[PDB]
Design a protein around this ligand. Structure first.
Ligand code: VDY
Length: 118
């Protein structure tokens, strides 16, 4: 049987592929339009337009090799709840942990909360 864990790993594999193609609109299309990203102790990023700008900004400054490790996923109603970790390479390691909620749009990101390691 298929698990939500496996479905979310597949969605994030595609996320990474689209990021590496420098397609920020493509990345942003994997979010709900009213999605929000809350990087702790930093400014919240609200809505798909601003989320596109975030990922575009990371592309432009040369951030590369995103890796997302899905640690736990549960499914409930139209939603998937995920714990994971992330690392990216910047011109240095950019790494941390997140929880996020996906909604069946195909799974799409709705809420992300993330912390960058101190
Ligand atoms: C360090 C840099 C590079 C230097 C910049 O000036 C500040 C900065 C921002 C990085 C961000 C902030 C927003 C949240 C981000 C983008 C994290 C994502 C939300 C991680 C979760 C990714 C996903 C798709 C699993 O949900 C990764 C890096 C974080």
């Amino acid at each position: 049987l298929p698990t939500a864990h496996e479905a979310i790993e597949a969605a994030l594999a595609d996320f990474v592929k689209v990021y590496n193609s420098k397609d920020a609109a493509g990345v942003a299309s994997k979010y709900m339009d009213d999605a929000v990203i809350f990087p702790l102790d930093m400014a919240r990023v609200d809505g798909r337009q601003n989320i596109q700008k975030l990922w575009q900004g990371l592309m432009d400054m040369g951030v590369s090799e995103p890796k997302f490790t899905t640690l736990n996923v549960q499914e409930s109603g139209d939603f998937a709840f995920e714990s994971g970790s992330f690392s990216l390479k910047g011109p240095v390691d950019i790494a941390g942990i997140y929880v996020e909620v996906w909604r069946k749009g195909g799974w799409k990101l709705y809420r992300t909360i993330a912390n960058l390691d101190p």
